[PDB]
Each structure stands twice: as structure tokens, then as C-alpha cells.
RNA sequence: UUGGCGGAAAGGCCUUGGGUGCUUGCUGGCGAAUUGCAAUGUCAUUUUGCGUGGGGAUAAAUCAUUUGUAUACGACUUAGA
RNA sequence: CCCUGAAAAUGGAUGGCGCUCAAGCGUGUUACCUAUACUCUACCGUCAGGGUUGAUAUGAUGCCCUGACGAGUAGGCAGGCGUGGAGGUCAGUGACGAAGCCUAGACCGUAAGGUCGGGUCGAACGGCCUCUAGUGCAGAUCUUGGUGGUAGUAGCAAAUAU
RNA sequence: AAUACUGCCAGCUGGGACUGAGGACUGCGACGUAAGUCAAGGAUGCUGGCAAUGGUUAUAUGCCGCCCGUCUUGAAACA
RNA sequence: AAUUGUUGAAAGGGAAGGGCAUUUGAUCA
């Protein structure tokens, strides 16, 4: 959602040219972040390795309002409330156990060929 | 057969050479064309100059930067000729075009390689004796090309170097022929002659 | 355990979809003949979808035949399963979706006892 | 149409290869003399060779012999029509028109 | 021996097609060294193989081959018609295939 | 019942196939295929290697030899469609090939479940091969360059057209 | 390893001396199989990361403030350890 | 044959590239490519000509044999799928899960449609032979409800000023 | 005399592609003095490999493909 | 369902969407 918005040099670090400085959304996100941090502290997760692994913003039911236009016409003037959710997680990913054996099927000619290579090579 | 085929542009009709090279590229053979400034077109110099002026007249009215790009170099003229022959819009045509490499003169990575001529696209073999032809280099330098002297000097230097190389090769070939003649008149030679080789 | 039958061939393995089904959401994926005066599908031009025709049928010998060579029969109880006692070579039982597991296990046991193939053996069963 | 005088060899080849009869308003192939005798024995014709003879030499029962035979459905010529435009006269360089004895080659190519 | 080849090089030109309609079921193969149908009527019934490579092993090897046979001659330039068990992906209009010498009658 | 009843059930009685008038006849080999002929194999492990035709087995595969002191192909059976018969021929008179037959090369079909997921030759077979190749080289040595010819392997070079090559 | 030539895209070529193999130019010996009548029957190259040894040095840009030869915002042009 | 006659407005048409003992023009001869065209074969449907109560054995509206054909607006006829209800039957299914919904999962039927596997879910539902209709949507500037591009855009600039 | 051209062979033969429908016998024919056999009212024998072929969907490639319904002789229309 | 946000997969030189056949990726008896 950056149609017909102004450009700035503060967004150059992200590679984009059009960026803004929202206020209400930033305060709401910061409040929910502090709530998540408090929840993690209460649960027992240290804040050293906590990273925001999920976030989601959906549209809430609209609060209908009214506006007045020319020639005695009534138009649509509601809001767009947000449903915000977020999940922070402790980061821990060193290595896995890979896949299974993945047994291959060998033709008789293929088996003879590998036997020949084994017999010939040291 | 050869992975890359080098074709000289001397005395070669532009249309016939373009058709042959386009067919080969569509078949899947890598082709590099050298000395494209010596290509010859049937008709007189004034005829081809008028044709090129007619081509130049065509341009987009509202924005001339989006109109037909009338390239002036002989190599670019040859490339445009082949592009008018190959369907460049399709991916297969694009691949055929990237298979092409057209240069003016004899590049450094191609001076020391064998050059091949097209017997069915040569002016001396197709045009009637006494018919008027033109030179692509002269047409380009009269239309707006500005690098006629540079390529001429480079070609002269390359010709001198190749003449020295051919003198050395001819000496070596004479020595090899003398060695073969001495090796002849032997039993192996008679058996080879009887068996053909 | 199938009777010797000719190899099953299908003249049209694809699904006949209605025109503009992928263009408009109101148009479902159910075939409807185009009755428009200028409909390209109805006029059968080149490069458009193919209307179903009488020629796209299947051989009556290999019609209604599953790839395993057994006709599909829907069963709901042990008494229904007893119908295919002397016809297990051509017909295969199929438990409907409304039968609970307590009857499904009995139906499967009876089918195994009588040598009747079931097209859905792993249905509503513990993993 | 293209029409011409046929020969015995091409008549025999046509009758042998694409020879079909008309029995009970059906195109039953002729692979035995029994069917020909059953459907044409009243006219003295009882074998495929007799039918070919009646075709080549016009006789008392040529009308019935020809009516018994289904029209021969030939294919396109194997070696081509030999002309660039079929819809021109034979003297004008096409397949349209009388071909006289030249019809034998075209018939055998198409058969 | 520096060369170990038991086949004949061929180039996949295109399918048996027309001005605006093409038939993927039949392809056209050009044989190097053949210029007329008189000598093209020697590689008839021979097996053509397209030998391509993928990045995933199927049954121990990453090289997969598509097989077909020569059916008849196409044109006066030595091009022949080919019928494959699976039609070529049409991305190989100019690729190199191997025409084997079997079944050999000579 | 979800489905009421099939009105008529097909009878589950198999029908015998009709009598077929398709007899078998012996294979008619090509005129260029005659015992003692030098052959080049096109497909298989020993492709390109040159071999000698000895006997026509009843199963429509030619008995062929790769005499072991020349190139190492064993006494085997080869299909008629995977061999090119060269012009040169070395006779095989005095070489007994009556012992070799179809049941000589017994497959002994491998076991089903136990596949070679990981990890031989008969002394009788070695003995028959030695007996054959002794006389084979004894006759072959009478003419020059045949041993080296058969030891070398056939290959196709650039500019070689099989339709114009008289193998 | 010594030297020379090549700038158009040189990025390659020639050459000097030694070492490491082969040599089918000719004459011998040894083994080739149980891969079963064909089933590409691999050995070439285009990138990314990983692991092992030798080798080369420890930098800039943007935002922030400000300048004005610049401008709607961008952007341009400057400066301040 | 060619040339003057022969001049119209965005930049362009033998399609263009291009072609000159032509790849231009007239004529003569072969080879080559293809239409849902022609010949044969496999399958489906329709029509016509027939056989088949000497059976346990049922569907003679069933089965099989032979031949021919298969385009199509308005329109007619015929054969079939599905929806809301009622009668007979399945002594039908189901709280250990009925209906509904979701499901680039599977099967059958050329097709309308049917069926299975999994998740959600919570009290009803289905097959067979018939009767009945308020029985099938893609449009009618269709009636109602909700939702998108525009769009975080126009704009929130009269009335002296914080 | 030979040869060119045309037409005939119920003369022979080499190579390649598609198709395998029907399912105990019924008929028309040939070989064989005779048993019996056959290319004679629709393909069988042997052998090899695997227990990958193939179905659905996404992308890619070669070709084709104008927007649904109505009015109209004429629709995709700048109706 | 229209619409919207994240995760997972694919494509994107002035459109997307479809048909004829296949390669590759995912999945399937």
C-alpha cells in the first residue's frame, strides 16, 4: 500500500524509495511487543534469543459513519480497524537428521557394471 | 560438423548469406561471421543508398526513440537482415539469435582460426559478369558509419601478420612434401597406393 | 483376481470443463453447452475447448470397469455384501461413507472371509 | 468426372481388390463364388471370372451384372494426379475430360 | 582409441507440421552426411535416442533417454520422419540425437 | 442398500481362445550371415569388439565367439539384428560346436526377494572355450593381421558415412 | 624451465633445456567370462554452499546535522573525529 | 520487358527479411509437404436387413450377425442427471458421528452427475419402482445483503491568530 | 538384330511404418496318392528387464487461440 | 464465496487466462 505516496531517503536501507513514519500503528505494535515480552518472561523464556517469528494483521469489522457531499448525497465514511497477532520464539536451529535412506533400485546390468568397476578399480 | 563455423564476409551476397546462416542457426550450429564490411549487394550504390534513405524515413511520429532503430554498422545491418528472417519473438528464435556473433573485421579470438566461405552465396558465383554491385562498408560510411579507417588499418596489420604466418607455413609445407616424396618409392608406399590411401 | 478383459483405453482422459470457468467465479466447473449465436466454442473454431461428443464413448466390454478390472458396487451391510458371493470375479465391494467403524470392521472381515475385494479397505480406521 | 476405356487387366484388378456386391441392400464383400452364383445364377453368372467377363464384354445381362456390383470406392492416386490443376481438360492439361486408354494408369494408381 | 562411437549423429529439426498446424506425434531428424532420399533409404527402422541429463537420480543414474524409431523419409534433403514412444518436449528443436545402427540388415 | 441390485451379472466362466492358424517356421538368415564370418557387435557390453560366427542356435540367436586370446568375448549367443557381417571371413571347419545348444546356457532364474543390495564361472564352460579357441587361433594364424584386426575394436570417426561404407 | 611475438575483444601463440609416462614403428607372454539376445551402460562443464592445506590486506556507503552552484518529495552538490 | 506519362497528407507494406543468368516475368518435365478430403482398421451412437423360448437361464424393451451414415442457427422428437415433497420397499444408515462445508487426493460415466479417502462439524439422512411441483441461472442499466481496483487517494484551504 | 516409349505377368524377391479386433468346432480352399499339414471366415511362439509405465496439478517449450449474451445479411467492435 | 494477512510452492522483457504433445517439480495404486 504505497500508491501515490511521497518518497524519502530514510527508506534507502530497505531498497525502497517510498516510506512513511506511522505513529498509531507503531505505538500499537510496540505495546503488543511489550505484552509478548512480558508473557515470555512470565512463561520463563529469556529475552536473549527471542525473535518475532510470526506476525499477522487482519481487517476487523468496520465502524460505519456518515459524510455529507454536494447535491444532498450521503456517502461512505467508515474506518478500518486492525486485528493484530504476533508470536515470538526462542531461536535454536543447529542441525537436523536429514532424510531417510532413500533405497535405490538397481537393474541387473547396472549391478554388473558397478561390480566391474569395483573389480577393476583399486 | 565444426562446433563453431567462421564465415568470411568477402564477396558474399547479403540476402543469400543471411538465409544460409539463419537456416544453420535454426538447425543448431554456432556461426560467427567476420569481415562483414566487405559484403556485396546486387544493384548500384545509388540504388542501395536510396533504399537505405527510404528505410531511414520510417520512424515513430510521437516518439522517435521508440521507432525502428536504423543501425549503421555493416555487422548490425547483417544482424538486422538475419533478424528479419528469424522469428526473434519466440524463445527458439531468441536462442538462434544468441547463437550468432557478427563482427567487423577479424577479431583477435578469430584471426588464428580457419575461415569458411559459402559457395551458394557468393557474388562471383551468382551475379552475372558485368552486373553492378556495392560494398556494405562504403554504404555504411556514406550513411553515417564513422569507423571505416580504424577497421582498415587493423585489417592491414592482420593481413601483414597472416602473410608472415603463411610464409612460415609454406616453408614447413614444402619441407613436409619433400619428406613425403623421400618416404615414397618404398614397399609401404606401393601397398598404400594399391589400397588407395 | 480379474477376468481376462481387453486393455482399457480412454478417448478423452481430461475433464470437460465449461467455458470461462477459469475466467469467472460464477461459472462452475460443470459442463454447459454454449447456445450463443456467436459463441466460438459452439461454432467449434481452432484452438478452443472441445465439446463432448458421441464419439468420446467407451467400449461396452470395458465400460464401468475400474483399472483393477472389478466393477464398483456400493454396499452398506453384511446382507448387502452377501449379494456378491458368486460374482467376486467382476464386482468389488465399496463401503459407503455413512457406515461407522464398528460395522466397517465386520464388513471387511466378511469380505476377507468370502474373498471379496474392497476398493476402500483403509476407511475410518486407526492409523 | 474422368472417364476412359478400361482394359481387362485393370478390370480384373478392380473386381479382385475392391469388388463388392449388393445383397439385401448391403455391401457384402465378394470372397467366394458361392455368393455370386446365389445372387446372379439366374443370368448365367456364377463366378467372379464370369462377372469380370460380363463386365469386359457387354452382353445380354451386362445391366444386371453392373447393378449387382457396388460402385468402387477408390483412394487418391499413389503417384499423384500428374497435373498441377485437376479441374482442366485433358487436352488442356488436367484430369477433367476423357482420357481414353490413359484411364488405366490412373485407375491402377488410385486402386 | 580416442573415439568410441557406435551411432550416427542427428539433429532434431522440428515436428511434421504445416503453416499453422503442427503434429507433435511425428518429428523430423536430419542426418549428417545424407543429402538425398536415395541414400536416406538406409537408416529406416533404426532406433533414435535422445540422451539428456537431469539433476535428480531416478534409478542410480541422472541420465535419461527417450527412444524412438525412423519411419520414412521426409523431403529431398535427406531429412527423415521419426516416431517416438514419448514425443520430444519441443524444447529440443536443434538438439543432437543418436541414431543407432541396429536393427542392422547390412 | 446404497445400490439396489445389478439386474444381470456377467458369467464368471473363462472362454477358451479360438484355434489359431499361426504356425512357426525356421528363421531365414541374411545372405551375408554365414558361419565363420567376422561380425561387429552394435549393442551390449562387448560392442565394437569383433567376433566370429560359428553356429546358428535353434532359438534364433547366432552362436558367436570372441576367442579369448584375441579380445576376451566369451562363447555367447547374439541377436541377428545387433551384428554387422564384414566382408572378410575365416573358416570354422574342424571346430566342433555340437555341444553348444539352448539348454547349455541355463539362466537359473535369480531369487525374487533377496536382491543384490550389496556385494563363479564354470570350469566346464572355461574348458569348452579353451577347446574352441585353440583351433580358432590355429586356423586364424594362417593369414596375416587377422589377430590384430580382431583384437582392435570398431568405431565410427568423423566424416564416416555408414550408408557409403562397405563393412 | 630460457627467451620472443600478440591491445580489436590482446587473456593466446611460438620457442629454449631438463624431468615425469606412453609409444601400436616391429616382435612375444599373461587376464578378459555368472553384466547372461540391446536396455545412455557415465568419466565432459555452469553456478552455490560445506570440509582440508599454502598464500594476499584490514574498507567504504546510507541515514542523522549542516552547506548551497538544487529541488515538490526524491535527487545534485558540500562540510564536520 | 522496361522508361516518361504517374502528385496527398502519423512511419510501412508482393507479410516482411530480402532477391538481379532472381527468390521478377511466360511456358515445358519430374521429386517433395499437407484438409475434420479420399482407402483400410479399432471404438461409440443412429438407422436398415435378420438370427436367437428345444432348456435349468433371468432382462426377447435381452443377446448376437451383416451393411450404411454421423455438420448445423431458429425449431421438433427421443433417451437420460439433479432439487423440494407423498405412497411401497431396503425389519436401509447413523451420537463408536446423520446432514452441511472445505479438500492443484482418488475412482466411474462422452456428457448432465455419482462415489470413496481426510479435516471441520454436530441430529438427522439415503438407494430402488412410482405420483406431485413454488424443481436447475450467467447476464434482464434484474430485487436484497456483503465485498474489491480506484485508495491510505482526492480532500480535512472562506470568516485576519496564535 | 539391339534399344527408347507404352501396356501385361494368376513372375520372384530386398527394406520400413500402423494395426492384433474376434475367442471350443461349424464355411470356402491348397499341400499331401494316403496319414496328416497349411500363409485357408481377425497373431502366436521364445526371451529379457522392473515389481519404473501411467493418472492429477504447476512451470517451461513448438503451433493455434479476439469478450460472454442479445439485435442484425453482416459483432470482438469505436453498438 | 466475493475480499483480506501470514506461512509453504511456482511464474513474471508492454497483460493474465485456454487447446493440441512432451520434459521437469510435487503428489497418487
UniProtKB/Swiss-Prot annotation, chain B:
N-terminally acetylated by acetyltransferase NatA. The keyword Amino-acid biosynthesis does not apply. InterPro entries: Ribosomal_uL13, Ribosomal_uL13_CS, Ribosomal_uL13_euk/arc, Ribosomal_uL13_sf. PROSITE patterns: RIBOSOMAL_L13 (PS00783). Keywords: Acetylation, Cytoplasm, Isopeptide bond, Ribonucleoprotein, Ribosomal protein, Ubl conjugation. Its main location: cytoplasm. GO terms for biological process: cytoplasmic translation; maturation of LSU-rRNA; negative regulation of translation. GO terms for molecular function: mRNA binding; RNA binding; structural constituent of ribosome. Present with 43300 molecules/cell in log phase SD medium. There are 2 genes for uL13 in yeast. This is Large ribosomal subunit protein uL13A.
Swiss-Prot record, chain C:
The modification Phosphoserine is found at residue 39. GO terms for cellular component: cytoplasm; cytosol; cytosolic large ribosomal subunit. InterPro entries: Ribosomal_eL32 (IPR001515), Ribosomal_eL32_CS (IPR018263), Ribosomal_eL32_sf (IPR036351). Keywords: Cytoplasm, Phosphoprotein, Ribonucleoprotein, Ribosomal protein. It is found in: Cytoplasm. Component of the large ribosomal subunit (LSU). Mature yeast ribosomes consist of a small (40S) and a large (60S) subunit. The 40S small subunit contains 1 molecule of ribosomal RNA (18S rRNA) and 33 different proteins (encoded by 57 genes). The large 60S subunit contains 3 rRNA molecules (25S, 5.8S and 5S rRNA) and 46 different proteins (encoded by 81 genes). This is Large ribosomal subunit protein eL32. It comes from Saccharomyces cerevisiae (strain ATCC 204508 / S288c) (Baker's yeast). The lineage of its organism: Eukaryota, Fungi, Dikarya, Ascomycota, Saccharomycotina.
UniProtKB/Swiss-Prot annotation, chain D:
Signal peptide: none annotated. It is found in: Cytoplasm. It comes from the Eukaryota. Present with 101000 molecules/cell in log phase SD medium. There are 2 genes for uL30 in yeast. Component of the ribosome, a large ribonucleoprotein complex responsible for the synthesis of proteins in the cell. The small ribosomal subunit (SSU) binds messenger RNAs (mRNAs) and translates the encoded message by selecting cognate aminoacyl-transfer RNA (tRNA) molecules. The large subunit (LSU) contains the ribosomal catalytic site termed the peptidyl transferase center (PTC), which catalyzes the formation of peptide bonds, thereby polymerizing the amino acids delivered by tRNAs into a polypeptide chain. Component of the large ribosomal subunit (LSU). Mature yeast ribosomes consist of a small (40S) and a large (60S) subunit. The 40S small subunit contains 1 molecule of ribosomal RNA (18S rRNA) and 33 different proteins (encoded by 57 genes). The large 60S subunit contains 3 rRNA molecules (25S, 5.8S and 5S rRNA) and 46 different proteins (encoded by 81 genes). Belongs to the universal ribosomal protein uL30 family. This is Large ribosomal subunit protein uL30A. The gene is RPL7A. The chain holds residues 134 to 244 of 244 of the full protein.
From Swiss-Prot, chain E:
One of its GO terms (cellular component) is cytosolic large ribosomal subunit. The modification N-acetylalanine is found at residue 1. InterPro entries: Ribosomal_eL33, Ribosomal_eL33_CS, Ribosomal_eL33_sf, Transl_B-barrel_sf. N-terminally acetylated by acetyltransferase NatA. Component of the large ribosomal subunit (LSU). Mature yeast ribosomes consist of a small (40S) and a large (60S) subunit. The 40S small subunit contains 1 molecule of ribosomal RNA (18S rRNA) and 33 different proteins (encoded by 57 genes). The large 60S subunit contains 3 rRNA molecules (25S, 5.8S and 5S rRNA) and 46 different proteins (encoded by 81 genes). Component of the ribosome, a large ribonucleoprotein complex responsible for the synthesis of proteins in the cell. The small ribosomal subunit (SSU) binds messenger RNAs (mRNAs) and translates the encoded message by selecting cognate aminoacyl-transfer RNA (tRNA) molecules. The large subunit (LSU) contains the ribosomal catalytic site termed the peptidyl transferase center (PTC), which catalyzes the formation of peptide bonds, thereby polymerizing the amino acids delivered by tRNAs into a polypeptide chain. This is Large ribosomal subunit protein eL33A. It comes from Saccharomyces cerevisiae (strain ATCC 204508 / S288c). The gene is RPL33A.
Amino acid at each position: 500500500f504505497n500508491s501515490s505516496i511521497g518518497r524519502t531517503a530514510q527508506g534507502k536501507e530497505f531498497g525502497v524509495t517510498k516510506a512513511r513514519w506511522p505513529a498509531k500503528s507503531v505505538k500499537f505494535v510496540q505495546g503488543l511487543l511489550q505484552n509478548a515480552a512480558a508473557n515470555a518472561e512470565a512463561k520463563g523464556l529469556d529475552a536473549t534469543k527471542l525473535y518475532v517469528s510470526h506476525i499477522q494483521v487482519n481487517q476487523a469489522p468496520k465502524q460505519r459513519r456518515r459524510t455529507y457531499r454536494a447535491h444532498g448525497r450521503i456517502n461512505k465514511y467508515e474506518s478500518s480497524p486492525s486485528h493484530i497477532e504476533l508470536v515470538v520464539t526462542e531461536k535454536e536451529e543447529a542441525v537436523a537428521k536429514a532424510a531417510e535412506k532413500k533405497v535405490v533400485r538397481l537393474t541387473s546390468r547396472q549391478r554388473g557394471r558397478i561390480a566391474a568397476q569395483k573389480r577393476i578399480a583399486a | 560438423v565444426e562446433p563453431v563455423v567462421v564465415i568470411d564476409g568477402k564477396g558474399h551476397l547479403v540476402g543469400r548469406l543471411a538465409s544460409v546462416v539463419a537456416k544453420q542457426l535454426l538447425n543448431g550450429q554456432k556461426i560467427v561471421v567476420v569481415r562483414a564490411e566487405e559484403l556485396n549487394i546486387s544493384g548500384e550504390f545509388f540504388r542501395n543508398k536510396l533504399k537505405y534513405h527510404d528505410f531511414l524515413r520510417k520512424a515513430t511520429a510521437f516518439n522517435k526513440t521508440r521507432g525502428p532503430f536504423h543501425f549503421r554498422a555493416p555487422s548490425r545491418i547483417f544482424y538486422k537482415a538475419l533478424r528479419g528472417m528469424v522469428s526473434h519473438k519466440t524463445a527458439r528464435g531468441k536462442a538462434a539469435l544468441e547463437r550468432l556473433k557478427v563482427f567487423e573485421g577479424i577479431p583477435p579470438p578469430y584471426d588464428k582460426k580457419k575461415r569458411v566461405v559459402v559457395p551458394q552465396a557468393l557474388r562471383v558465383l551468382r551475379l552475372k559478369p558485368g552486373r553492378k554491385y556495392t560494398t556494405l562498408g562504403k554504404l555504411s560510411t556514406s550513411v553515417g558509419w564513422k569507423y571505416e579507417d580504424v577497421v582498415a588499418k587493423l585489417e592491414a596489420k592482420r593481413k601483414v601478420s597472416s602473410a608472415e604466418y603463411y610464409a612460415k607455413k609454406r616453408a614447413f609445407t614444402k619441407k613436409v612434401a619433400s619428406a613425403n616424396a623421400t618416404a615414397a618409392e618404398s614397399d609401404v608406399a606401393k601397398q598404400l597406393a594399391a589400397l588407395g590411401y | 483376481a480379474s477376468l481376462p478383459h481387453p486393455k482399457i483405453v480412454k478417448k478423452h482422459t481430461k475433464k470437460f470443463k465449461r467455458h470461462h470457468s477459469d475466467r469467472y467465479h460464477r461459472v462452475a466447473e460443470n459442463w454447459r453447452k454454449q447456445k450463443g449465436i456467436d459463441s466460438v466454442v459452439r461454432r467449434r473454431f481452432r484452438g478452443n475447448i472441445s465439446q463432448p461428443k458421441i464419439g468420446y464413448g467407451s467400449n461396452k466390454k470395458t465400460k464401468f470397469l475400474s483399472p483393477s478390472g472389478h466393477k464398483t458396487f456400493l454396499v452398506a451391510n453384511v446382507k448387502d455384501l452377501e449379494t456378491l458371493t458368486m460374482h467376486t470375479k467382476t464386482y468389488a465391494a465399496e463401503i459407503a461413507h455413512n457406515i461407522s467403524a464398528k460395522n466397517r470392521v465386520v464388513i471387511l472381515a466378511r469380505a476377507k472371509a468370502l474373498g471379496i475385494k474392497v476398493t476402500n479397505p483403509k476407511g475410518r480406521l486407526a492409523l | 468426372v474422368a472417364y476412359g476405356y478400361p482394359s481387362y487387366s485393370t478390370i480384373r484388378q478392380l473386381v479382385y481388390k475392391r469388388g463388392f456386391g449388393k445383397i439385401n441392400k448391403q455391401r457384402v464383400p465378394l470372397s467366394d463364388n458361392a455368393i455370386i452364383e446365389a445372387n446372379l445364377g439366374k443370368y448365367g453368372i456364377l463366378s467372379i471370372d464370369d462377372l469380370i467377363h460380363e463386365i469386359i464384354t457387354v452382353g445380354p445381362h451386362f445391366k444386371q451384372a453392373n447393378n449387382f456390383l457396388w460402385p468402387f470406392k477408390l483412394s487418391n492416386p499413389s503417384g499423384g494426379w500428374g497435373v498441377p490443376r485437376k479441374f482442366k481438360h485433358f487436352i488442356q492439361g488436367g484430369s477433367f475430360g476423357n482420357r481414353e486408354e490413359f484411364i488405366n494408369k490412373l485407375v491402377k494408381s488410385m486402386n | 582409441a580416442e573415439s568410441h562411437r557406435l551411432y550416427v549423429k542427428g539433429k532434431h529439426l522440428s515436428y511434421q507440421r504445416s503453416k499453422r498446424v503442427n503434429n507433435p506425434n511425428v518429428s523430423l531428424i536430419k542426418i549428417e552426411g545424407v543429402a538425398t532420399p536415395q541414400d536416406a533409404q538406409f537408416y529406416l527402422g533404426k532406433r533414435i535416442a535422445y540422451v539428456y541429463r537431469a539433476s535428480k537420480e531416478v534409478r542410480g543414474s541422472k541420465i535419461r533417454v527417450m527412444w524412438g524409431k525412423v519411419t520414412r523419409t521426409h523431403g529431398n534433403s535427406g531429412v527423415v520422419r521419426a516416431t517416438f514412444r514419448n514425443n520430444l518436449p519441443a524444447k529440443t528443436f536443434g538438439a543432437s540425437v543418436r541414431i543407432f545402427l541396429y536393427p542392422s540388415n547390412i | 442398500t446404497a445400490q439396489q441390485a445389478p439386474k444381470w451379472y456377467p458369467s464368471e466362466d473363462v472362454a477358451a481362445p479360438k484355434k489359431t492358424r499361426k504356425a512357426v517356421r525356421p528363421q531365414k538368415l541374411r545372405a551375408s550371415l554365414v558361419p565363420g564370418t567376422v561380425l561387429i557387435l552394435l549393442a551390449g557390453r562387448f560392442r565394437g569388439k569383433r567376433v566370429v560366427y560359428l553356429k546358428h542356435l535353434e532359438d534364433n540367436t547366432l552362436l558367436v565367439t570372441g576367442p579369448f586370446k584375441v579380445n576376451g568375448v566369451p562363447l555367447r549367443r547374439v541377436n541377428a539384428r545387433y551384428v554387422i557381417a564384414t566382408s572378410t571371413k575365416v573358416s570354422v571347419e574342424g571346430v566342433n560346436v555340437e555341444k553348444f545348444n539352448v539348454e547349455y546356457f541355463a539362466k537359473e532364474k535369480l531369487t525374487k526377494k533377496e536382491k543384490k543390495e550389496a556385494n563363479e564361472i564354470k570350469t566346464e564352460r572355461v574348458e569348452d572355450q579353451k577347446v574352441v579357441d585353440k583351433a580358432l587361433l590355429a586356423e586364424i594364424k594362417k593369414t596375416p593381421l587377422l589377430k590384430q584386426y580382431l583384437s582392435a575394436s570398431f568405431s565410427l570417426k568423423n566424416g564416416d558415412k555408414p550408408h557409403l561404407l562397405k563393412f
